[PDB]
Amino acid sequence: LSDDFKQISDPKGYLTYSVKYEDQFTKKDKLRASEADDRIVGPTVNLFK
Amino acid sequence: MLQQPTGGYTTLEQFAFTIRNDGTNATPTQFLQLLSYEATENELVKKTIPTPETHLPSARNVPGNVYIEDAITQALFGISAQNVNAHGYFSRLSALALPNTSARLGLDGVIYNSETINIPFYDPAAVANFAATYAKLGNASTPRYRADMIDIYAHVGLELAGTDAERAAGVMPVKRAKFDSWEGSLISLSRDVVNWKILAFLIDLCSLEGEALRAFKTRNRDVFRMMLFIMSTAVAANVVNRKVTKRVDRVLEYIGVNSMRTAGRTATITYDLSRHEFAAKFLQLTFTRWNA
Amino acid sequence: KIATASSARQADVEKPADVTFTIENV
Amino acid sequence: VSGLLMVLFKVMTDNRLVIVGETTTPMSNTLSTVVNNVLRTTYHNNVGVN
């Protein structure tokens, strides 16, 4: 067959969120999500910390 | 869109203003009833308020949803409010001031550049009337347009501690307010106030005319008095407690006399010079509308 | 195998207050 | 402007065709309720940010 397409998994998009942090701001309190909720919500929370 | 009630938006139970009194809900008037005054040798004598400048900030287009209500209530009442004179928010306000602008001011207190339908929003004519004056808050800092931060507070005192005879006279003795109080009563009072949807009160104050607005002034006088009280504590030269018969009586001194105090304190919210310029301009505009 | 008594009491963990250099709000 | 063409061009010729990656089917009891409202039985291990 002709290689008309390019099979891929977990596709990368055209736009992505860049983020600049001010590193002196951290909440004194520490969240403790369940491991699964961290597996799901985690990359997000780590990015928008 | 919410059609404006003939009595103004404030007649709606959606915009009731209320404050906790030792943690229980109460109308502002029944807090003000707790207030007691001790006059002193000095006398406040209100001057004519200078007429506000006609120059609105240019209505430049800006990214995002300006949250104008939170900006105003914070700058007046919020603890240690910041960036109160950043110009963009009022650029959007003056954008609202235009005759047929696409921007709409939601009941949320947000302004949306799009016609984003799902959120209910105030009638555009009323907000045009509102922005036409309160965009001028956008020149609170600009040197040509700065409000007198001192004499204006006399009006504050007159509308707060003033007896009806003291008010008609246009002069009152400088007063020291006091009231039975819970700890942190002033901060909690300011928290209760800063959550007020004052945009309903101001859109009504600007848009309403004739008998309906005059009835509106008689009706909401306690709310305006309360906002005035939070501001007065923000400028009170000194604030303390007296321990009479187990009860503690908070004592703010003195009403109606700004002290230009800038450093914060445990007792009360405290304006930085920027917040003073802002509050001053707000008072100028708001009293100019209030007395007509 | 002989029975035994024992005891415990809740410990103090009163550290003198820490000096964080990080701030938590604007 | 030259760059815009390359975005346009590179997007004109994206021939990627998605295949499912590693997935996960959390039990509802291990997820905090809002996440359960948002999840739909299963998800790719590489959820990106949102």
Added chain:
Amino acid sequence: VSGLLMVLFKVMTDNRLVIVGETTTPMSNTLSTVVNNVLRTTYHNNVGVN
């Protein structure tokens, strides 16, 4: 009796002034429901007995 004075005295002159220690904000889903009823969003890591 001498000892009581020292309790009284030592308590007369306690100048400790609390600063918040390390805290924790468990998600409600990781707490058994009664503890969730008792907890108030967050707590010091060193909860003592009660």
Added chain:
Amino acid sequence: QHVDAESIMTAPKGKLFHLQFMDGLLRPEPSAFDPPASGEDMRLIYPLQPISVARSMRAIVNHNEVDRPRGAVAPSSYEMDTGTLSRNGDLLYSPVANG
């Protein structure tokens, strides 16, 4: 970077200038006993148009542990819609009004 006035008045037409702009919103209050600053902080270069157009969220920090900082920006709702495929298979945002 540090732009001299002369460079802005002599950069060749068609060369891309690269300017930097502070978002000083995340700047903590001065210490109450920090020494007064006698002189002023002045600034000359300003944008003519909105710049922060790629901005999605701004100032992810608290102000008094409830109040939002003035000028902080929550993400637009569309970032989170994930609606549905259309009858033909086009992507769509979810319906606004029910009808």
Added chain:
Amino acid sequence: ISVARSMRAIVNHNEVDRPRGAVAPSSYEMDTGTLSRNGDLLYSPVANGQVGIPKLEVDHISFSNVVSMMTANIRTGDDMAVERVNPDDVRAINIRNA
């Protein structure tokens, strides 16, 4: 004698019945009521209408209480400093007038 006793015999009797003489902790050990209007500690209200009795006012020990505390250390380290400036000429100084 057992006046300091709070709980006694934390073991089952027939996996339901309490052993005779076992003692559950008094309710006050667990009240954690509220600060009063002036800021005194208080047990929670008993009947719905009545106000809560202050914890110091009664003899019961209570092991949960609401303690006010600063969120972080008070001593930030920005200690105050000042510009003392001396009198220009010692002879010209005005000792007089109070």
